[PDB]
Write a protein that binds this ligand. Structure first.
Ligand SMILES: [Mg+2]
Lengths: 133, 176
């Protein structure tokens, strides 16, 4: 999109020295003991994002045994017959935390509050009806 | 004759006694050279130049009395004055098998602190050159309640790591 690739890095964590001094004062963290420190804030260097996106190479085309699949789909469906679903109008959705990111390119002009707050119920129902075709 | 002790009981499976030279004591020499309390040089049979005899270290009972040395067992009053230094201790061992039989090898080490180390079976095998601290093959005790040790025959550790771990554990437990 733009003329230079961005390299994102991941900073290390922060240390709470008072609690560590407390815990060693009360006799924790002994050598050879069972409880210890195993959970840290690991840092990453430059080409971290792409080196993790590259992990999709384990996804390969897969052809399924169509008949046994057509049976197990019925059984799985039967595991799922105690609930109720169906479309609902715009004025019945429940959004917790209307203050998260809105994806790309929208995140250039505010959080999800903006778009969930600048489109009347008519526009939302019209958008649904549109994607239904 | 004679009262003896399990101390240094040569538990090797081999059947022949020792040649006078390269025998540690008198009892260990074979019977050929033995002619009334003395050994006689028979150049007929020569000396083996390779042999591995696993030695036992079972009952070591020290009550020595010297001046510049502090005795290693204390009474019931002095041990009371010196609490804050008490630490439990218990060991679970194994048995020697294919090259020698008769003794125990330590395998697990507990402490009053929750730590449990575990070592590899080693013993003090002697050799025509000298004594040698080397690996030995073993097997758990046949007691059924000891079956929870069968996995532990495939964990470490070389003793040169284990004793360092012990030193550091005791250090950071009793330094204050
Ligand atoms: Mg025990």
């Amino acid at each position: 999109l733009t003329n230079n690739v961005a390299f994102q890095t991941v900073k290390p964590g922060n240390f709470n020295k008072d609690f560590y001094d407390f815990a060693v004062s009360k006799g924790f963290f002994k050598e050879g003991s069972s409880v210890e420190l195993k959970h840290f804030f690991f840092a990453q260097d430059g080409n971290a994002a792409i080196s993790d996106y590259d992990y999709y190479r384990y996804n390969l085309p897969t052809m399924c045994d169509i008949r046994q699949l057509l049976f197990v789909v019925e059984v799985v469906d039967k595991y799922f017959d105690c609930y109720d679903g169906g479309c609902i109008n715009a004025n019945q959705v429940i959004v917790n935390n209307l203050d998260k990111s809105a994806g790309f390119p929208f995140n250039k002009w505010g959080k999800a509050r903006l778009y969930y707050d600048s489109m009347s119920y008519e526009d939302q129902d019209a958008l649904f009806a549109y994607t239904k075709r | 004759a004679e009262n003896v002790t399990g101390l240094f009981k040569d538990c090797s499976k081999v059947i022949t006694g020792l040649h006078p030279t390269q025998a540690p004591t008198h009892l260990s020499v074979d019977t050929k050279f033995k002619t009334e309390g003395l050994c006689v040089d028979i150049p007929g049979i020569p000396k083996d130049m390779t042999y591995r005899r696993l030695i036992s270290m079972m009952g070591f009972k020290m009550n020595y009395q010297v001046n510049g040395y502090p005795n290693m067992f204390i009474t019931r009053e002095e041990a009371i004055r010196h609490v804050r230094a008490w630490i439990g201790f218990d060991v679970e061992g194994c048995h020697a098998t294919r090259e020698a039989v008769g003794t125990n090898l330590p395998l697990q080490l507990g402490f009053s602190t929750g730590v449990n180390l575990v070592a590899v079976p080693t013993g003090y095998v002697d050799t025509p050159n000298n004594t040698d601290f080397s690996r030995v093959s073993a097997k758990p005790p046949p007691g059924d309640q000891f079956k929870h040790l069968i996995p532990l025959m495939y964990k470490g550790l070389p003793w040169n790591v284990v004793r360092i771990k012990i030193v550091q554990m005791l250090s950071d437990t009793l330094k204050n």
